[PDB]
Amino acid sequence: KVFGRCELAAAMKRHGLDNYRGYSLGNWVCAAKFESNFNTQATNRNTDGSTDYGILQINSRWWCNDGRTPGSRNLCNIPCSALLSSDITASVNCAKKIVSDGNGMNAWVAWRNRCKGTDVQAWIRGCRL
């Protein structure tokens, strides 16, 4: 499912992501935009052979099991197919785990190189949330 900008923001707020570990809702929308483009089915193979899954392009190396990432962990205890569901609940649950560590939303390359430092608030602008 390809989300709308505001639709998604609204859904993430519902899931306890607005200012989660100090990161306002616009940061999360911005990340989704440049990670998946709001498409929950986005998958992307990494050079190391791990695969990024879903709306927030969560990685098989650490967070989920795709059954083909040798030497990996599954710290969110989920199949990576759980991350392509149009119900964003496992993506968001697993995001809270990733951001709660020590590198924050710097774990998301697209956030760091495309959101960090921006007027991220623009991503929830004109959204009835």
Curated annotation (Swiss-Prot):
Domain C-type lysozyme positions: 1-129
EC number: 3.2.1.17
Catalysed reaction equations from the record: Hydrolysis of (1->4)-beta-linkages between N-acetylmuramic acid and N-acetyl-D-glucosamine residues in a peptidoglycan and between N-acetyl-D-glucosamine residues in chitodextrins
Entry comment describing in which tissues the protein is expressed: In the egg white and polymorphonuclear leukocytes.
SS bonds (residue pairs): C6-C127, C30-C115, C64-C80, C76-C94
EC main group: hydrolase
Record Gene3D superfamilies: 1.10.530.10
Annotated localization: Secreted
MF (Gene Ontology): beta-N-acetylglucosaminidase activity; identical protein binding; lysozyme activity
Single biological process term from Gene Ontology: defense response to Gram-positive bacterium
Pfam family, one: Lys
InterPro entries cross-referenced by the UniProt entry: Glyco_hydro_22 (IPR001916), Glyco_hydro_22_CS (IPR019799), Glyco_hydro_22_lys (IPR000974), Lysozyme-like_dom_sf (IPR023346)
Residues annotated to bind substrate: D101
Alphabetically ordered keywords of this record: Allergen, Antimicrobial, Bacteriolytic enzyme, Disulfide bond, Glycosidase, Hydrolase, Secreted, Signal
KW Signal (keyword) present: yes
Record PANTHER family: LYSOZYME C (PTHR11407:SF28)
Complex and partners: Monomer.
More info: Lysozyme C is capable of both hydrolysis and transglycosylation; it also shows a slight esterase activity. It acts rapidly on both peptide-substituted and unsubstituted peptidoglycan, and slowly on chitin oligosaccharides.
Similarity remark: Belongs to the glycosyl hydrolase 22 family.
Name of the protein described by the UniProt record: Lysozyme C
Lineage: Eukaryota, Metazoa, Chordata, Craniata, Vertebrata
Gene that produces this protein: LYZ
